[PDB]
Tab-separated table of C-alpha atoms and ligand atoms in Angstrom:
chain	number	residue	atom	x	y	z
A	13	UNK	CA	-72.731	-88.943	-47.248
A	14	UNK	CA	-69.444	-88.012	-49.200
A	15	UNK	CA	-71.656	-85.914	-51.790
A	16	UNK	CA	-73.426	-83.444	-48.754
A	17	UNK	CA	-69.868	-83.588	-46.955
A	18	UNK	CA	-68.043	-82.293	-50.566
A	19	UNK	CA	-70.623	-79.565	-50.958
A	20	UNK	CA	-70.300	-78.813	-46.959
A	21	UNK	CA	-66.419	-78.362	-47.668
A	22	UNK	CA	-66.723	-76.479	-50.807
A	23	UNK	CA	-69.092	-73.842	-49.751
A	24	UNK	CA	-66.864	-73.298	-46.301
A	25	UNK	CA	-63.870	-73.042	-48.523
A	26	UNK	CA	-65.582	-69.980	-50.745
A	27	UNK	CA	-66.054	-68.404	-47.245
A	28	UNK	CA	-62.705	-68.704	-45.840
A	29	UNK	CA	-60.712	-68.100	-48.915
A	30	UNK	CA	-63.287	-64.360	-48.514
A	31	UNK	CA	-61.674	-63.832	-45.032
A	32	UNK	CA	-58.538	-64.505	-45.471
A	33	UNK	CA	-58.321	-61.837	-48.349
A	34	UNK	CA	-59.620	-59.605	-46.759
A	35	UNK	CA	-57.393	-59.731	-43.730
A	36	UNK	CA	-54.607	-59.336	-46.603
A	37	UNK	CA	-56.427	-55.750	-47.898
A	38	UNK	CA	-57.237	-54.433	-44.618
A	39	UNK	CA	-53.193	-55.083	-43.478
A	40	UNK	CA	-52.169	-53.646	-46.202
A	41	UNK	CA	-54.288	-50.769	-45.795
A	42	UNK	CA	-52.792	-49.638	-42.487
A	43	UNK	CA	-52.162	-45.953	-42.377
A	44	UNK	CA	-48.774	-45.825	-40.540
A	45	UNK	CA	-47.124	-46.957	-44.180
A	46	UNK	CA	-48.432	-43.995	-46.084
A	47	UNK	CA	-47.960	-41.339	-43.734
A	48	UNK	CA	-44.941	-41.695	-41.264
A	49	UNK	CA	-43.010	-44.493	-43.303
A	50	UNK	CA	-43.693	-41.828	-46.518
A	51	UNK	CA	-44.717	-44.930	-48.595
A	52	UNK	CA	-46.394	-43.705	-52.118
A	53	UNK	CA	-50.509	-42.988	-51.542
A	54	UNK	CA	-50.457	-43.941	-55.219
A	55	UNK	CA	-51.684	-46.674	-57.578
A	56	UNK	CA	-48.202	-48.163	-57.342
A	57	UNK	CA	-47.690	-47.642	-53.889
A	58	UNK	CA	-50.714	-49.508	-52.763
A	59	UNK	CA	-49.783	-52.417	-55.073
A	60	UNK	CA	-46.674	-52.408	-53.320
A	61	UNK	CA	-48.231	-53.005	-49.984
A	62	UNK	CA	-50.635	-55.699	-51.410
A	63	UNK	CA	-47.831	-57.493	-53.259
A	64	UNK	CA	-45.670	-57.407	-49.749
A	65	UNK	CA	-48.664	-58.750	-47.750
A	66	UNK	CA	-49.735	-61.265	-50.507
A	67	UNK	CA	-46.131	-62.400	-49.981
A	68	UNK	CA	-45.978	-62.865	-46.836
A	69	UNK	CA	-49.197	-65.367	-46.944
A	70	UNK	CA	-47.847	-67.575	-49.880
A	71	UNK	CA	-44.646	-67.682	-47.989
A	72	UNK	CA	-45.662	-69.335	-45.067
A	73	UNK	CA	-48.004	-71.487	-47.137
A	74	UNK	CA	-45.639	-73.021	-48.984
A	75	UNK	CA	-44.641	-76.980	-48.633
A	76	UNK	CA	-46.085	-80.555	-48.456
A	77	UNK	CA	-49.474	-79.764	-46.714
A	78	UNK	CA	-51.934	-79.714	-49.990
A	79	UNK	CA	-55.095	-77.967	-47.736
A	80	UNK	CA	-52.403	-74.816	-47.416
A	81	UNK	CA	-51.132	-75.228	-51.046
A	82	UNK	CA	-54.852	-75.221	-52.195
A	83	UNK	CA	-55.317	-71.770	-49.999
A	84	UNK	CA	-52.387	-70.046	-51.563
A	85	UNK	CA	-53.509	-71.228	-55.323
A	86	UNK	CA	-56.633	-69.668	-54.043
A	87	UNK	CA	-55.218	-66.571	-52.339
A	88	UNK	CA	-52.568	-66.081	-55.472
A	89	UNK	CA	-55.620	-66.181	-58.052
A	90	UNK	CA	-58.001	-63.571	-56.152
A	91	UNK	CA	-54.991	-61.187	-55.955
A	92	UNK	CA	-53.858	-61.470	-59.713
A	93	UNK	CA	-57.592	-60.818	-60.462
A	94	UNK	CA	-57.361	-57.472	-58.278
A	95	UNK	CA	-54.363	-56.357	-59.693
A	96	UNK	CA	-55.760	-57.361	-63.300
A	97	UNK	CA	-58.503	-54.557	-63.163
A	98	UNK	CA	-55.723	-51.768	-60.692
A	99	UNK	CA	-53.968	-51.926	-64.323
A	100	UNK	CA	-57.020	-51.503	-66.099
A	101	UNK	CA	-57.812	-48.569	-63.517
A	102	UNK	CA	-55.074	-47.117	-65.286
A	103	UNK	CA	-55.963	-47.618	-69.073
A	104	UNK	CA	-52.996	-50.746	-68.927
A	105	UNK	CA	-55.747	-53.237	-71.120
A	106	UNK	CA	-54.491	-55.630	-73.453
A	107	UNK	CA	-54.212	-52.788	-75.984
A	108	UNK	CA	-50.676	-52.591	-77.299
A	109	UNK	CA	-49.886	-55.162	-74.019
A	110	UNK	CA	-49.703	-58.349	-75.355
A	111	UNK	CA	-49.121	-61.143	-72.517
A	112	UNK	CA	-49.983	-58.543	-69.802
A	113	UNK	CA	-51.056	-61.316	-67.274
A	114	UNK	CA	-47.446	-63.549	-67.866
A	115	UNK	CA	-45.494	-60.166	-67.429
A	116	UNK	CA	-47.700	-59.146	-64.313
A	117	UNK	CA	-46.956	-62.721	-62.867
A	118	UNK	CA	-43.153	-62.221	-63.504
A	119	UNK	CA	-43.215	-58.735	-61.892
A	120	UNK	CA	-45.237	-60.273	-59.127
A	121	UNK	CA	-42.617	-63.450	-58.300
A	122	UNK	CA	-39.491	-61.798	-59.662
A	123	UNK	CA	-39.928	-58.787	-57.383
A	124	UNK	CA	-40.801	-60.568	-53.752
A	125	UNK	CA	-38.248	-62.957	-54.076
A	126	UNK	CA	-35.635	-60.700	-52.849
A	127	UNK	CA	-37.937	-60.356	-49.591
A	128	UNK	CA	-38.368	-64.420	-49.511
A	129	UNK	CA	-34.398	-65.245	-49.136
A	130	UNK	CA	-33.800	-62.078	-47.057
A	131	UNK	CA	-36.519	-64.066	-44.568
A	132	UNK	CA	-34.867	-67.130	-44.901
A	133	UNK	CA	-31.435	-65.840	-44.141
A	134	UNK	CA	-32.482	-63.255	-41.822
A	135	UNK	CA	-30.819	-60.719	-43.155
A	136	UNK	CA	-32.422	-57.431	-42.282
A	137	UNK	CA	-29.833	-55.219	-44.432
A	138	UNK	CA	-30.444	-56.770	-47.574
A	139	UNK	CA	-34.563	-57.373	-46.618
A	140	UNK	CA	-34.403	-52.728	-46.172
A	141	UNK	CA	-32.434	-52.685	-49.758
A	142	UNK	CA	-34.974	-55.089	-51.165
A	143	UNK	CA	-37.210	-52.640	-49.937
A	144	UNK	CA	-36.145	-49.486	-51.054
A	145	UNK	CA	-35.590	-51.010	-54.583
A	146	UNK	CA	-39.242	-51.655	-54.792
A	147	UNK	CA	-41.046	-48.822	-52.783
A	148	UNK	CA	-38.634	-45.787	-53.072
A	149	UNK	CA	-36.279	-46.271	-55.788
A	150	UNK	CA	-36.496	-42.642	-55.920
A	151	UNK	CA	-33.993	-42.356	-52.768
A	152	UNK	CA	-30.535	-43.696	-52.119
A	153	UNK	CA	-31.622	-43.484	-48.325
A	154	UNK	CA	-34.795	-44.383	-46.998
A	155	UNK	CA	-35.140	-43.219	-43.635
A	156	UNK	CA	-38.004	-45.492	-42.714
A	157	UNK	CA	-36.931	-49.031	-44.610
A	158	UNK	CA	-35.580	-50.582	-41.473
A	159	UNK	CA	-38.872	-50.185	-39.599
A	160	UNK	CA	-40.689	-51.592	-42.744
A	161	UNK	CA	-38.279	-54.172	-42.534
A	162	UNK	CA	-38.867	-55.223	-38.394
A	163	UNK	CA	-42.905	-55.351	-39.368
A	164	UNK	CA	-42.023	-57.300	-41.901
A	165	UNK	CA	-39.813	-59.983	-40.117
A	166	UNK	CA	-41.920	-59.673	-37.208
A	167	UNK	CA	-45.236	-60.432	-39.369
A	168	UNK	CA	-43.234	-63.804	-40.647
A	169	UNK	CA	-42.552	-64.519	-37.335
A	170	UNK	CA	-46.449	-64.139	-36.207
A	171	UNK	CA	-47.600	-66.149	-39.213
A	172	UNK	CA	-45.035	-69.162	-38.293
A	173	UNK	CA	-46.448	-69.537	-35.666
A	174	UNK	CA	-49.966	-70.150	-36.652
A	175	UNK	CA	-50.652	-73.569	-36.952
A	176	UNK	CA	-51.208	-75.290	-40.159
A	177	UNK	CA	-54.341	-76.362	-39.328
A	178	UNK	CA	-56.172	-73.024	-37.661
A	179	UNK	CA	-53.990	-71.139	-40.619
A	180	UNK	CA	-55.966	-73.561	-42.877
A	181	UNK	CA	-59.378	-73.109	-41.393
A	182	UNK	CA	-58.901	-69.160	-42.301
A	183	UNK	CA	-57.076	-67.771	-38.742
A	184	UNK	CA	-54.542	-65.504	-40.224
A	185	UNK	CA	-53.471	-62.617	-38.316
A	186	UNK	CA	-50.229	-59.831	-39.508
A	187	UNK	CA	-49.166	-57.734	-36.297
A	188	UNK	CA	-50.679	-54.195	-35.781
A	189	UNK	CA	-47.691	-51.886	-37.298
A	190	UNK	CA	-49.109	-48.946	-34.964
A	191	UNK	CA	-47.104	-51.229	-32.215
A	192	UNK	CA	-43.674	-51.374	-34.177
A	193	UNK	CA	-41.047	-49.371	-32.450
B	12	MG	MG1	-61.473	-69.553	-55.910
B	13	MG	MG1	-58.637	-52.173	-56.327
């Protein structure tokens, strides 16, 4: 039996580790963040929004249960394979690029962590500046950073919430940011 039940498992993981990404692309697809909260419409900008949503998933994954530690190795490894072919999108191949994947990783981890102990200290002021250093360096004031910042706390919140084991069995949801206000 433990042979059929391992290949029962295995093939139901493939399809939920599917699901759950895409619920990752379509939230951070929404269309509020590129035209009201003026977020870049551009190759960076979308990684942005990817990266912030990826985030958010490993986040809550994080800790002692190995079926959601397994999900976010999963999770982690479809999104650096994305972002591995965005850069090469771009003409960004190994070409002159030496360790592009370690540097990617380090821009991935080094970046979100500001947004990781703003969360954990609930600190909205310093989760907005993490924000505007990453999206919109471009302006001293962001206008629309602070309601970035709610969706984001409130999407941390909504995940939370989730129990490990639906979370686990692929029922991740982020809130609708069409109902931030
Ligand atoms: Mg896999
Ligand atoms: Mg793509």
């Amino acid at each position: 039996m433990i042979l059929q039940l391992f290949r029962r498992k295995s093939k139901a993981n493939e399809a939920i580790v599917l699901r759950v990404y895409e619920v990752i692309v379509a939230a951070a697809r929404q269309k509020r963040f590129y035209a009201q909260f003026q977020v870049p419409d551009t190759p960076l900008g979308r990684y942005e929004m990817l990266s912030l949503h990826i985030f958010l998933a490993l986040h809550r994954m994080k800790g002692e249960n190995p079926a959601l530690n397994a999900l976010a190795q999963e999770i982690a490894d479809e999104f650096f394979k994305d972002v591995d072919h965005s850069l090469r999108e771009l003409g960004i191949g190994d070409q002159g690029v030496p360790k592009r994947m370690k540097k990617l990783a380090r821009m991935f981890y080094g970046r979100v962590g500001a947004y990781g102990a703003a969360l954990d200290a609930n600190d909205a002021q310093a989760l907005a500046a993490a924000l505007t250093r990453n999206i919109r360096p471009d302006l001293e004031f962001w206008p629309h950073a602070c309601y970035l910042g709610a969706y984001v706390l409130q999407c941390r919140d909504c995940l939370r919430e989730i129990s490990d084991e639906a979370l686990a069995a692929g029922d991740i949801s982020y809130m609708d940011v069409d109902q931030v206000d």
